Structure formats: C-alpha cells, structure tokens
Design a protein around this nucleic acid. Structure first.
Lengths: 90, 612, 290, 17, 114
DNA sequence: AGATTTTATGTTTAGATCTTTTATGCTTGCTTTT
DNA sequence: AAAAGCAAGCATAAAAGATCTAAACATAAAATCT
C-alpha cells in the first residue's frame, strides 16, 4: 500500500511479497502456501481486509487500517521476532 | 394450420383416463423378446452384484464411523473421495441409508444441490428430509420445518432412548459456497443437542474441500477421508467377470468391445452409460428374429430349433458365414437349401460347435493372457480384454506382435520360463475346475482341453529333465492352444453370427450423437440425403444452381469472411438463381434458427457467423 | 466432421424424394416403440423440420396412450406451464408447487403410485427458445429419468449439447436417430423469436399541429444534415403549434411511441431529437409534404 | 454378391453336379 | 489424484492454455491480473490445435465441457444465460502443477506452448 | 345443532417494471510493426 | 507496404434501485355431512 499508493491488492501479490522476505527470514522458510492462504482468510474474516464491492486467490481487496494503527501494533506486539521488526521498517 | 400449432398454448394434453409393458402381446410372447429379457436380467443382476461387492468395504467403514459417533462442539464428518462419475454413486448412498436404517443406528437426509439454492431452502429440505425419513422408517408443510421443530421432534421421539442425524451431501462440488459454509456453521451450532454426522461426496480431491472451507468453517470440522475404488478398475472388473464370462451365450465382437471401452476411457467414466450401450447392443442383436432367440443355453436352444417357422430358416441361411459352409461341402446341399426339415435336424450340431468354440476361446484366453502379459513391453497387452479384442479382430499368429512375444519368451532363462508356463497351467486348470465344470457343455470342453494341457505339462517336464527344447515347448503351446482354440472371428465355425454381434455402424450411429456431422453433410451435399438425379456435386465447393435453397445461401455464407452485409449476399444469391427475396429471407431465418449466423445489433442489415 | 482451427485463428423431383424420405422415417416407427419400451428416449437431429414426423408418430402410433405434446419453439412457454400441465391434467393433483424441482419430486411420487399408466412426452425442439437455460434441461432430464415417462424430442441448434453435462446426458437415456427431412422450418421460425412508408402511414393519422411539429424537426434535420429541445420549443411557441412545454413533451412522447423520433440526452442536460432516417428519403418526404 | 443370386447359383452348381 | 477421461484431459489443458496464453499468442502458437477469459470456440480451437488426432464434434465432447464446468474445474465468469449464443465467457481455475501432471500422464508437453 | 370441506378474501413475498447509472463490448478510426 | 494495436463512440446491456403488480400462502365465511 505504501509503494503503490493505496492500490487494491490480491492474495498472489501479497504472498509474493511475503515469500521474498520468507526466503531470507530464517524462521519462516517452512510455511506452505496453504497456511499463508488460510492466514489471508483469517485476515479477511476479521474485516481487516475488505473486498472491492473471480477466484478466492485472485479477488481484489482493500486494507481497512491506517498505517499508524499497524505502526502501533508493531510496538504493542508481544514477543515479536527481530527479523520481522527489521523487515517492517523497510 | 395444424391444431397443435396454437398462438396461445404451449403444451397440449391428450389425456386418456390417467388417474392418480408398452408393447402388445404379440411381441412379449415372441421368443426373441423372452431370450433378450432373460439375458439382460442376468447381465444386469451380475453387474449390480459386482458393484455392491466392490462398494461393501467402504460401506462397512462408513457404517462403523456413524455407529462410532453414536457411541459418543465440532460436527463429525466424513469426506468420501468418490469418482468423477457422479450419477453412479446414488446407489452407494442409497445402500448406506439402507444399512443405517436396518441397524436402527441413524436417520438420513440427502441434500441435493438443486434443493439448496439458499440457506432457507437448505434448512427446510434438511428438516423435511429428516422428519419424513423417520416417518417413512416406521406431512408438515415446508414453510414450517424450522430447526426448532427438528429439535422438538427429536426430543419428543429419541430423547428417551441416540440416533444419529446423518446428512448426506452427494454433490459437494455443485453447492453454493456461502450456503454450504452457513449450513456447516448451523449444524455445528447444534452439536451436543442434536447429534449430526455430515458425510460428503467429493468427486474431485481433498484440495477442493480445503479450498471451499475457510479458517472459521474448518475450525468446526473433524473430517475423515474414505476412498471409493477407481472407475477404470470397476470397468476392468465388469469386463472380465461379466462380458467375458463363459456362462453367457451372447458375445460382443472385438470392434464393438473396443468401441464401448473407447467411449468409457476416452469420454465419460460413467459405468451406467457403458451398461446402457451394452443393452442397446444386446437389443439390436436379439431383435433380429427368433433365429437369434436360438442364442441361448443348449437345452432351450434345442427347444427353439423345434419351435422354428420358415422366416427364421431364411435368416439363418442369409447370414454370411453360411456361404463358406455351403461351398466347403450335392443332394445334401439340395436338402439344406430347400428341404428345411434337414436344416432343422442339422442345427444342433452347429450350435454345439459354436458354443464349444467360444468356451474353448475363453479357456485358451485364460491360459494365454498370463503368459503374454507378464512379459515386459507387453506386445498384446496385459488384461484379458485386450487379448480378446486382438484375437477376435484379426488372426493372431500372422501379427508382428505375436512374433515379438515368441522372441521375448525365447530369450528367457529356463527357470522363469518353466515357472511362467507352470503358472499358466495351474491358472488354466483352476479356471477349468471352477468355472467350466458347473456350466452346461462344459464337460465336453474340459474333455477337449485337458489332454492338451497334459501334453504341454509333459513338454515342461521334458525341458526340466533335459536349450532347443524351449522352442518345442513354444511350438506345442502355439499349435494346441493358439492355433486351434483361438481363431479369428472370420474363421469362426459357421452360424457364429447368431452368437456374436458385429454390426458396429448402426449402433455407433444410435449411441454416439453427432448432430453437426448430419447438418454439415446436409448443408453441403443434399444429394447424400435427397438422392436426386440432378443435385449431385462432383466436389463439395461447386455450388450448382439446382441445389435446395438453404444450401446456396449456406455456401455463399461459407465462402467469405466473418461480418457479412446482407445486400451483396442477396445480389450473389439472385445471380445464382419478387418471391426470390422472400426465399432469401426464409433461408437467412432458417440459417439463424440453426445458430450458424446471428443478426448484428450495433450495425443494421449485417450478420456475423458463429462458426469457424 | 473434424473442423480446422485455422478458420478461427484467421477470422419437381424434390417432392418425390422428400416423400420417399418421409416414408422411410414413417417405416422406422415400430423400432422406436420397442426402443422406448426398453427405456431409451428418442432424439432426432436432422436438418429440416421434424414437426410433421413427430405429429405422425403421435397420430399413427400413440393414438390411445396418454401424450403431452410440448411446443419448444414457442417463445412464451415456461417450464412451470409444462409441470402445471402434467400435475393438473394428467394426475388431477391441482397446481404444481412453485419450486419446479419440488414439482418434479411430486410428479415422481405420483407416477410411482401408478404403474402401467405411461405418459409419452413429445418435445419438438428440446433446444427451444425458453428451454435453453440449464434449469429447464435439468427438469426435463429428471422427468425423462422416470420409468413411466417416455420422451421423444427434436434438436435443431448446432450448440445444443453444451448445456447437457454427463448427469443430464445420463438421465436423458437418448437413442440418437438421424431423421433428416428436408422440409423448411415454417412453424419453428413463424413465431416472434425469429421505413418511409410506415412513417407516411403514421403521419397521415396525426393532427395539423403534430404535422407542424414533425415538419419543424424535418426542416431542422435537412437544414443541419438531432435538434436540441429548446429550439423546437421556441419554434413551436413562435408558430403557435403548442400551448406550453408539457403538451410538446406529450407530442414527443407520442412520436417516441410511434418511433418517428429518437431522443438522445446530452451530458449538458439538453434533449436531442434525431430522426432515424437517411436524409435522401427525408428530403423526398419533405418534397412529399409540399 | 447378393444372397439370392448366390443361393440360386449354388443350387445350379449342385443340380449340374 | 484427479483421474480424468482422456479427452477431458485434453480439454482441461486446452482451457489452461486459453486462460494462460492470452488472445494474441494463439496465432503464433497454433497455426503451425488473473486467468484470462476465453470463449468456448477458442477452447475448441486450441483443443483441435493441440490434439493432433482430430476427433469429431460429437455430443460427448461438449458434454465433457459442461461437466468440467460442473466440477468447478472451469467456471462461468460471465455469460451463463446464453451458453449457446456464443456470448459465454469461461475461465480455467486450476494450478500449473496439475496441468504438468496431466501432461505427464497424457504425453503432451504443455511447457512448449507457454 | 355441531363437524367438514368449500370458497372467498386478505397478506406477503417473489417477480415484473421504471428509471438511473455505469460498463464491458461491438464497432470505428486511426496507428503502427513486420 | 500488411496486419496487429491504441484512443473514440455509440450501443446493448447490466447493475440497481425504487416500484408496482401477479400469484402463492394463510385465513375466514359457509354450504355440507352427520
């Protein structure tokens, strides 16, 4: 969202951006694509991600959060691994 | 016009005393209808017995799963990875309901996808199916069958005793996703109060189950996977145990056999369509006359010979194999071609000859298929059906593949060769004891075959107690089994046409439907159908001027591009041949009615072709 | 028929011959009776109209059995009409339930209650104008599944089996038969599914002020080779052809009803008044009015 | 070869034998 | 683990090439975001181009098209009401690895046409 | 003098209709690579 | 120079959104049977 200026995303784009971190994360190497897909559906049922109102893996979506809320989640989170805390800054 | 053609009504009752076996007694009392009904009832009951004996293991596992839930929140649920051939499995789910009702362990609703477009309709058909199923074991309106009424009914009935509430969902892939997830959440909400079990019918794979069930829905699922056997395995079991059984007197030819298996393996995995196509083959065979009612077991066949009239004698004379039988014979052929009673007295020898030849064909095939299909690269195929099609379609010894089988069997070491031939001998002897001895005309078949097997076993003992003897053993196997008892269908004993069915063209026409081929050859050359003395074309693109009016418009259509102006089309058709404009409008309207063109909407007086 | 994909990637004697063809298809009938007795359903897929052939089968062979003819080429038939026809007239069970599959369940129960009361079902054009949805074909396949109900049907469209999946094609236990008559599609195309003179005929019925209003639009169209509404309103108020705006809107509503004038609204909110006729014929029409 | 003319020719070959 | 008929396998890989290869590349591959929409005649053209055997257009082949649609192996992204009029648009809904497995069982190398 | 279909009536929900508005698509008109 | 490629333009049509209406469903008045 910060790069493309709040353009609508997709499960494939977000899984690719996550796997580019997961290949060097040295803790997230073991996840299956299906676990990331069920995590994306878990984001969708909390209405942290809302559909633009097509396959479930290709439906377009919108973030329902301001960036400041995610930034305060980054500080309020318990036992956050340092690799994710470094990846969040850049 | 016709009274049926009305501007107002669309349906026209012709009721004749309907309240709230089509043929007459001449056909049902004909012997060929009797033998056709007998052979069809035997074949259909044997195929149903094979399907039940293949399903029975998964049936016992599903019934044990339901009773194990009854011995005891998430709803327990059992995915059943069934095949692509969805219509066939209704008998499986019906057998599951029969077992669950016979044990008094559960009551079953069945939720078809047609009944559940919405969550309301799904809940109504579910509660209505459970209440009316319990009523049918030992009628509320569908507007009032609420889940609260299901709970009140279950408390009024079975709280004093626990019956499971099995909810079959046979077509899991056809459901709306939101209705199915809401229904799973509804059934999970009532667990503890109402014991639900949710068996499913997944035609594809478990990845579809993991895809259509989200994180929230699969949080309340405790599914177990059962697997139905594969459809080609069921086809191979039916083809080996039914269509190749010695006990049936009706055999398919190799072309018809390959055609029905080609429809199964290359188009649809429905066993039911293969069974209906075999039923059409059986009907097309047996409806040729009482001469084909001779095609039965030997005693009823002798009774049919003593029943016969004269048209049956004519149609046993007309069939092609009789002509070599006559020319390979003077007074005897005058008595055969005219006297009729001599042919009635000589029929039992020919019928016993044909039935004995087909029994020896099945026994020699049960020999040869192990010895050939154990080999690497398999020149003649593995199972009995491919060697059946190969030995019937053409003479086997003249084929290159038999030379390859003889070479690759000649290259064997002595121990595996003697073990292979001894395995073929033990398998053939077990088949001769198990399946040919109960059968009528099986004692004579065993008396023909058994000394030849003893001679092959003595050749095996000769190659055991002593390099070049393996070639003599192959020669004994060739000329006492392959040469004598495995002839090509043209070399079958005469009047074998009563027993085989080789007419593949009309049955391929009436089973395989190709409307586009008929429309193509009717719109290209009408002379193929009309058979006019003037309308023949030496080539299909000629466009002659005496053609029927749809064909000329269709050809001037075919010979150009996509978008077509109507006006130059009309000038070309007027150049080929007022009322001519009405004939062109009628032809364009018929050609639109067939779907070949369509009128443009954005551009007036134009047409686009839908074909390529 | 084995089509090539490059055409997509680059994109008298006749009466006697037709009578011999029809006599052969009439000779086929007892075989169809035995095939229908064995549970197969008949499907015809010829070129020409097969209405007279199925009518001859109903007339000569099914003269006493119960028969529900269904005209599938009818533009306005519904599957509710056919299920209501079976439920009300064949079984005397009243109106069918509003869910069609519930009606098929009811028909299956009531026909299970009565063996040897066969219902023949003749459907000219199973690919009909209102039977081309998947749901009506599912209803027809569920009806043809019944042992009591036998089905004969015609097929004409080239793309018909795109809506029959293997479940419907297994319920439709079809015995395909090439009944290629060469008869023209009269009745099938007679229905609704498949001009300066009309403008003069409607212009004759108009009153004098309506003639003046249409002549004003004709003069503006020939002068400009669609007029904004305000120019027509000012011209009519100058020529005293209208009393106020609403009567002019009623006259243009009448012209829209009789299709002399097409109204195309602009993005600015003004209404444009095109006359949908070429200007040579419009110039001839203006010369006709002089 | 049609069945009728074949049956007739075979009967002629028998009666001429 | 999805067992299929032979012509259903060729129809399914042809639908995958129709949804994965875009409309313009068929002219260069066969004359001899998301998955793309494709009309049924485009599917039949790619199927006849990759078949190299040329079976006739029987009822059973278009029945295989409709029953692949019913199993959610294909989908109706539009059209629906007019499948027969040629305005229908289908969309293949399977992954690449199942197509490579089908091309292993068949012997048709899918990756040449991608 | 009381129970039972029978019928006439009112309500409710699904479907037809009017209207705006928005969009992909059908065609056009250049536009541009091979 | 030939045929694939990007803005333009009206058009069927598709959503939609209110809106009105026809038929299915619940219900009451009433002849009918006891």
């Amino acid at each position: 969202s910060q790069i493309y200026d709040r353009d609508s995303f997709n499960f494939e784009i977000i899984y690719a951006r996550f796997s580019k971190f997961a290949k060097v994360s040295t803790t997230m190497q073991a996840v299956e694509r299906s676990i990331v897909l069920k995590a994306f559906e878990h984001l969708r049922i909390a209405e942290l991600i809302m559909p633009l109102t097509v396959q479930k893996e290709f439906e377009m979506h919108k973030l329902a959060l301001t960036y400041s809320q995610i930034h305060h989640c980054m500080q309020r989170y318990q036992a956050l691994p340092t690799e994710v805390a470094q990846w969040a800054q850049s | 016009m016709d009274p049926t053609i009305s501007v107002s009504k669309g349906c026209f009752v012709y009721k004749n005393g309907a309240t709230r076996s089509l043929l007459g007694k001449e056909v049902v009392q004909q012997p060929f209808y009797e033998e056709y009904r007998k052979a069809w009832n035997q074949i259909n009951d044997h195929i149903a017995d094979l399907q039940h004996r293949s399903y029975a293991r998964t049936l016992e596992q599903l019934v044990d799963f339901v009773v194990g839930q009854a011995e005891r929140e998430v709803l327990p649920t059992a995915a059943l990875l069934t095949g692509i051939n969805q219509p066939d499995h209704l008998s499986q789910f019906t057998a599951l309901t029969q077992r669950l009702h016979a044990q008094r362990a559960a009551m079953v609703c069945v939720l078809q996808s047609r009944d559940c477009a919405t969550l309301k309709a799904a809940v109504e058909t579910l509660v209505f199916g459970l209440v009316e199923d319990n009523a049918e074991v030992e009628r509320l309106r569908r507007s009032q069958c609420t889940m609260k009424q299901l709970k009140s009914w279950y408390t009024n009935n079975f709280d004093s005793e626990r019956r499971q509430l099995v909810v079959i969902l046979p077509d899991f892939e056809c459901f709306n996703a939101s209705v199915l997830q809401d229904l799973i959440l509804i059934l999970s909400a009532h667990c503890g109060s109402l014991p639900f079990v949710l068996v499913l019918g997944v035609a594809t794979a478990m990845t579809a189950v993991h895809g259509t069930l989200p994180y929230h829905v699969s949080s309340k699922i405790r599914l177990r996977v059962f697997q139905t056997q594969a459809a080609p395995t069921g086809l191979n079991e039916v083809l080996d145990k039914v269509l190749l059984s010695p006990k049936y007197a009706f055999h398919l030819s190799g072309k018809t056999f390959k055609f029905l298996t080609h429809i199964f393996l290359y188009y649809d995995f429905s066993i039911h369509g293969f069974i209906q196509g075999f039923k059409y083959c059986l009907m097309e065979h047996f409806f040729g006359g009482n001469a084909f009612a001779l095609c039965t077991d030997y005693s009823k066949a002798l009774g049919r010979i003593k029943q016969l009239t004269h048209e049956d004698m004519e149609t046993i004379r007309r069939l092609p194999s009789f002509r070599p039988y006559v020319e390979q014979i003077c007074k005897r052929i005058i008595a055969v071609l005219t006297d009729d009673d001599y042919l009635k007295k000589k029929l039992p020898q020919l019928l016993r000859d044909c039935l004995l030849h087909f029994l020896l064909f099945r026994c020699s095939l049960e020999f040869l298929t192990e010895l050939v299909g154990d080999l690497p690269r398999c020149p003649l195929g593995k199972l009995r059906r491919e060697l059946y099609v190969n030995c019937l379609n053409r003479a086997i010894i003249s084929t290159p593949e038999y030379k390859e089988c003889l070479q690759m069997l000649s290259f064997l070491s002595k121990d595996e060769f003697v073990a292979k031939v001894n395995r073929a001998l033990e398998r053939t002897e077990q088949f001769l004891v198990e399946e040919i001895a109960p059968l009528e005309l099986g004692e004579a078949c065993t008396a023909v075959l058994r000394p030849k097997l003893e001679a092959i076993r003595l050749a095996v003992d000769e190659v055991v107690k002593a390099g070049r003897a393996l070639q003599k053993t192959l020669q004994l196997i060739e000329t006492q089994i392959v040469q004598d008892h495995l002839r090509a269908l043209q070399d079958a004993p005469p009047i074998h046409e009563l027993f085989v069915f080789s007419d593949i063209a009309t049955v391929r026409r009436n089973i395989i439907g190709a409307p586009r081929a008929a429309l193509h050859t009717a719109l290209n050359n009408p002379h193929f159908y009309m058979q006019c003395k003037c309308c023949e074309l030496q080539d299909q693109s000629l466009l002659v001027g005496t053609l029927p009016d749809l064909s000329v418009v269709y050809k001037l259509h075919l010979e150009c591009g996509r978008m077509i102006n109507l006006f130059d089309w009309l000038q070309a058709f007027r150049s080929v041949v007022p009322q001519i404009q009405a004939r062109f409008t009628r032809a364009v309207a018929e050609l639109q009615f067939l779907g070949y063109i369509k009128m443009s909407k954005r551009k007036t007086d134009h047409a686009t072709r839908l074909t390529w | 028929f084995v089509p090539e994909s490059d055409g997509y990637f680059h994109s008298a004697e006749h009466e006697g011959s037709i009578n011999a063809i029809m006599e052969e298809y009439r000779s086929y009938f007892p075989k169809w009776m035995c095939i229908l007795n064995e549970g197969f359903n008949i499907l015809l897929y010829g070129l020409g109209s097969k209405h007279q052939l199925l009518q001859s089968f109903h007339r000569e062979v099914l003269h006493k059995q119960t028969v529900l003819v269904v005209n599938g080429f009818f533009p306005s038939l519904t599957i509710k009409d056919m299920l209501d026809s079976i439920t009300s007239d064949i079984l005397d069970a009243g109106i069918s339930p509003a869910n069609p599959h519930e009606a098929v369940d009811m028909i299956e129960e009531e026909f299970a209650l009565i063996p040897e009361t066969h219902l023949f079902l003749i459907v000219h054009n199973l690919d009909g104008a209102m039977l081309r949805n998947v749901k009506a074909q599912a209803i027809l396949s569920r009806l043809a599944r019944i042992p009591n109900i036998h089905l004969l049907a015609s097929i004409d469209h080239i793309n018909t089996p795109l809506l029959w999946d293997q479940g419907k094609l297994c319920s439709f236990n079809f015995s395909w038969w090439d009944c290629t008559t060469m008869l023209p599609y009269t009745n099938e195309t007679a229905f609704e599914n498949s001009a300066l003179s009309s403008m003069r005929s409607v212009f004759s019925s108009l009153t004098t002020n309506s003639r003046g209003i249409y002549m004003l639009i004709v003069k503006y169209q020939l002068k400009n080779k669609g007029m904004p509404f305000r120019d027509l309103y000012s011209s009519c108020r100058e020529a005293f052809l209208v009393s106020s705006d609403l009567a002019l809107r009623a006259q243009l509503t009448e012209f829209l009803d009789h299709k002399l004038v097409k109204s195309k609204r602009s993005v600015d909110g003004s209404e444009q008044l095109t006359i949908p006729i070429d200007g040579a014929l419009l110039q001839q029409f203006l010369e006709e009015q002089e | 070869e049609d069945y009728e003319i074949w049956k007739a020719r075979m009967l002629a070959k028998a009666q001429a034998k | 683990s999805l067992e299929l008929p032979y012509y259903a396998k060729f129809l399914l890989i042809a639908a995958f090439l129709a949804s994965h290869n875009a409309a313009k590349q068929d002219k260069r591959l066969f004359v001899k975001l998301g998955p793309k929409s494709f009309s049924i005649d485009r599917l039949l053209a790619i199927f006849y181009a990759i078949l190299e055997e040329k079976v006739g257009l029987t009822c059973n082949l278009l029945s295989q098209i409709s029953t692949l649609v019913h199993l959610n192996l294909l989908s109706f992204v539009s059209g629906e009401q007019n499948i027969m009029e040629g305005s229908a648009r289908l969309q293949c809904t399977i992954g690449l690895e199942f197509v490579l497995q089908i091309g292993k069982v068949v012997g048709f190398n899918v990756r040449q046409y991608l």
